[PDB]
Amino acid sequence: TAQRFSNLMAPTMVLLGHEGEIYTGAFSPDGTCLATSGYDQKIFFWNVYGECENFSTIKGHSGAVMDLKFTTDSSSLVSCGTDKSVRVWDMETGTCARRFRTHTDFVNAVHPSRRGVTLVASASDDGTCRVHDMRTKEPVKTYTNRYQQTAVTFNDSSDQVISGGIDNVLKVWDMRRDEITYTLTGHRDTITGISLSPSGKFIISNSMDCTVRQWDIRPFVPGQRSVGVFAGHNHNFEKNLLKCSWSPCERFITAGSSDRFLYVWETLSKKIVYKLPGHMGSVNCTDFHPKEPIMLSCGSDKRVFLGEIDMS
Amino acid sequence: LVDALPYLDTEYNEADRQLAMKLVEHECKTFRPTKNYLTHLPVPDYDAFLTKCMLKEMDRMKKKEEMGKLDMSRCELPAPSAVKGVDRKLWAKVLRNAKAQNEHLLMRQINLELMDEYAAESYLQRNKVMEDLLTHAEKELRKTKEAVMEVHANRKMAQLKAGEKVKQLEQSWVSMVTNNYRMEMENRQIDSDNRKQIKALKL
Amino acid sequence: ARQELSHSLYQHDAACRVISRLSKELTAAREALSTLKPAILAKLEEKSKSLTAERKQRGKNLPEGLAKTEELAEL
């Protein structure tokens, strides 16, 4: 016998059925299921518990799904891809609720507003951040930056759009001003993913310089906004948009890695807590289950790995 | 509520001990043991089970008097003098004593002769039993020492694990108090807006 | 052993008087940080400097008219 930490059917589960590089993966905020997609364009849904049966599979993108996020109430899945389109998928219906056909190049990342009216921030190879409101065909905001933007998130109040890209500097756009109120400078190479802490105080940002830097995005900060730097993971010649994510208790951080290892760092000490093997290619996206200590990792190897971790 | 954790509160010095007890001394100088602290324990009946005889014997040594002793001069048995030989009873009492000692010495000889056969064996056997008790007692002593030590282990492993949370929460609390107070000064200073708003409204 | 047990519990309970005062005084000090925003007595001693020791001079006996133990039984 051995210790157990979750309702998983086994301490590690291997989920198989994707037909191409899995670029993105996310849990439902209610903890019931998870959704994953990538170069094979289908979006696969998996239950977190029991047999983890692939209970649904949405199709419709005409391109790789680069990024994929649940809305906070779990009633809709936002997804975006190389078909220049953001789509919102209704969970109960399984159907495209909206199709924001207004980007002019590949959409690299997407993030729905955490609360209030549902807004969808998106960043694209056209260089623009756009915020789309479900109620209008036209975007609410278009923030033209000069160079291709690869990652985006709102702040927690959903009134600043944070983005990064080929220029390595993160922009922070203030949605009442329509100006960059400040920039976060420090990455040596292009950003591959940005993720917002549950409390909203901090963001992490992954970059092809093989570091994750934690930034303080609170309105007042008494000095430097760079909180700390994590290292250990690696980005290879495939130049995938390796994502990053927060533990729901914020004690731990993850980032994708090209070295096959699933990395977890402790937020306070910056020590690597897990460096789990088992993938056979780039671990493109990593996420934590919102209620229970379970790790998701999605590989370029077409495999999804679910497993327990001791979140002590 | 006492909440000391001596494996975490390690700073406690002898100089602190003297100062701490001096404070309780300035209190216990002003607060005295008037309460019956022993109400959770029975009052002892020191004379439980004792007989009327044993009470008087306790009261003798309680008043610190020596115990009675047997007179043993009967073994030496002085002869009577010329002024006591007229008492026929006092002569018989000498002879009857001399007869009694003759048999005590006979039984002593029989005991000693049997003791010469078997004392060496029985004393050796006695030691062999007594040795076993000592080793078995030292086994019990060693076994209980480790158990006391194990309790110190489980205490340190608890207090140190809690000591990290205390140190994080303390360091977190002090960092926010200074940061939050700083913001209170900023939000006052940014009410310079009320100044510019007036001047811009007059324009 | 019963003498020493009473004294230690006393000394323990006497120390708890000190813990109680300082703990609340620490708590009030931390509460400030947690919310920080930008003569007859002497004549009484004089009278005490006789009456706590003097009053044998007049209280020489209990009153004679005070109830006996057999009388108050009829209350």
Partner: peptide
């Protein structure tokens, strides 16, 4: 430990209130 977590959490909620103010204030200075 329980008391310190309340002391921390009192400042955590105090901090959010002060920064909702600071954003509201600085967005009025602008």
């Amino acid at each position: 430990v329980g008391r310190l977590q309340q002391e921390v959490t009192t400042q955590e909620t105090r901090e959010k209130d002060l920064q909702k103010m600071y954003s509201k204030l600085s967005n009025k200075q602008w």
